[PDB]
Design a protein around this ligand. Sequence first.
Ligand SMILES: Cc1ncc(COP(=O)(O)O)c(/C=C/C(=O)C(=O)O)c1O
Ligand SMILES: Cc1ncc(COP(=O)(O)O)c(/C=C/C(=O)C(=O)O)c1O
Lengths: 351, 351
Amino acid sequence: MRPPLIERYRNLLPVSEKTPVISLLEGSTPLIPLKGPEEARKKGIRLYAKYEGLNPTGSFKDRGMTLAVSKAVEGGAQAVACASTGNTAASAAAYAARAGILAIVVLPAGYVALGKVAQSLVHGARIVQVEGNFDDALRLTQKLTEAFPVALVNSVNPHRLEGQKTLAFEVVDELGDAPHYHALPVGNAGNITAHWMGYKAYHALGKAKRLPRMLGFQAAGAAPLVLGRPVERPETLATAIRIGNPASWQGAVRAKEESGGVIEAVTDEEILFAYRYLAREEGIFCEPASAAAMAGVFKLLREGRLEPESTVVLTLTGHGLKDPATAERVAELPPPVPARLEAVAAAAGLL
Amino acid sequence: MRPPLIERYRNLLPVSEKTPVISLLEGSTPLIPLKGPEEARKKGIRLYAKYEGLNPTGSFKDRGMTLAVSKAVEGGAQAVACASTGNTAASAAAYAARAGILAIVVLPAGYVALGKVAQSLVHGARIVQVEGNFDDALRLTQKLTEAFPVALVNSVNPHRLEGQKTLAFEVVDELGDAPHYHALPVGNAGNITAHWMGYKAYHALGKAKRLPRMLGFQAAGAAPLVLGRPVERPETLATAIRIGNPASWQGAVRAKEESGGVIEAVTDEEILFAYRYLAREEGIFCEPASAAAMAGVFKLLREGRLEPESTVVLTLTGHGLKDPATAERVAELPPPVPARLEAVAAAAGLL
Ligand SMILES: Cc1ncc(COP(=O)(O)O)c(/C=C/C(=O)C(=O)O)c1O
Ligand SMILES: Cc1ncc(COP(=O)(O)O)c(/C=C/C(=O)C(=O)O)c1O
């Protein structure tokens, strides 16, 4: 039912009958139609959540990583490396283990979500925590791949974006056309770039009449693409996108311009509100960075910038399980009570 | 555009045109073929992992919750409740948020993995932590639902087994037949019961040529089914199955006897070994309780109790992200180093 992504889109990918397919059966994730928000519903605006949290490692990074490691192995690579806020690393770690090769991940000290650390650890990856942020780990890791015979699997590797563009193909395959708008978070910018590549590709093939407007959102304390210049000290509780100098900078600007979309900023508070809304009202638990997409939609809706009767697809990038710690910021765990029908019923608000 | 689990198997489920479908697009999870291990491959025994960690809330529980909540709302239920070691509660909280009703979850204080706690919290369930174990909470929750107008969604509710049995349907649909063996964890015994149900069904319907042996595995410190009597003080790091008086006790026993299988114990050490093996050797990150199934296979493989030239399927019940704390048990996180290629190469072990 959920075939190797490489196999599903073999026709549109730079692969051949000799490409070793290293796959954990990624992609083909649910496109969940949302109930609200109330604002959008009484405006005929329909929202769909492309839940990338259901990929093998819990994020969309598996999409780009399956093609990257597959091609790397095709080249005889026996190790890969990458800088990461957490998810790309977890993906490299898992696929390396799958391929039977070595994985080296460089993370920003103290700025990687507990779940993501747990993954690299258990998958037996070679972890290097550096005293710097993501942008520092990215530059460091690029050299690391030039000092040792290790394949770089960061978005700079063309295969990453080639694989990630498959998400747009899946959205069109399921809806029958491209949506009026597609919202997503923007970190190092590889994803928004890949999305746009996918939509233009299906459009040129005549599988999508319309080209959607790409709506990219960044945390206010790490919005380089929104200010128009790098952010040396990016900050945000949504650590997945605590990036101040996106590698695919031009890719995103181009995607924005060509699609007629935008790349704006949402505050950490708005992120947490959207974060809570999705889990509590829609039953969809994504990580804070992913919630930035919904927070961006709330923003545009609030400003009356979304046309009535339009379709909005949001790429919810990572599963909520990736960042357990943040759950404590939108709800508190009640203290224990005696194991008695009376005590429980009272604590349950039934008495 | 992609049907909910209830729809994929509507003809085999207790639903009708009157049943409102509460779905998060669950089921249809990957059946990943494993590379080994060596003991198996040498005997010509192939293994496949049904990765239920990729269901919407990260556990096979979604299969039953979708049917249980839908059937609850069809009957007018305004709230649902369940005792839980974490996954049934997370599932319940999510499907309740989806259906727009209340979810009350009774958790054993101190014995629910934090990923699972983060889920119930963010999804907005009314959490009640009791000073007792799962068995205590289940007993209390059954009394609570018989006392107040709240539908019980624990596996005691037959709808949960009807939903979960679909896993076997999917395994057969993909493999074309049922495996010689099917191993899984046994906690409150609802899953093994449903597995046999689904297999006996497809077999009679002519879809399943043979019948699997059903190999259930419990943690040594919480193996009432292996002991023959309830375990008053269940103990194990795999808190998901820290259960001493399984509700589906009879269903588990009959499934064992009827399929000519076994319900055996595995140590926590064997669990960890299996846990690391799957994530580091196969690239699949499941939680400890899930690994108990692989630990059982390693056990039968070494005891020479698995027939050569056989197919073995394993139900990996939950995603590793559910319980990140256990990662430190099989791997340590290296302390930070300066942001210098020089220092990173050293920390990477490349010198
Ligand atoms: C959940 C989640 N949501 C959004 C992004 C932003 O996507 P891009 O704009 O394509 O970079 C990330 C990024 C992660 C990393 O860059 C890494 O892990 O190294 C993420 O984990
Ligand atoms: C990952 C995981 N693996 C295996 C089991 C055992 O299956 P059952 O024998 O059908 O109960 C559970 C059980 C969880 C609960 O019983 C609960 O959450 O209340 C689990 O979370």
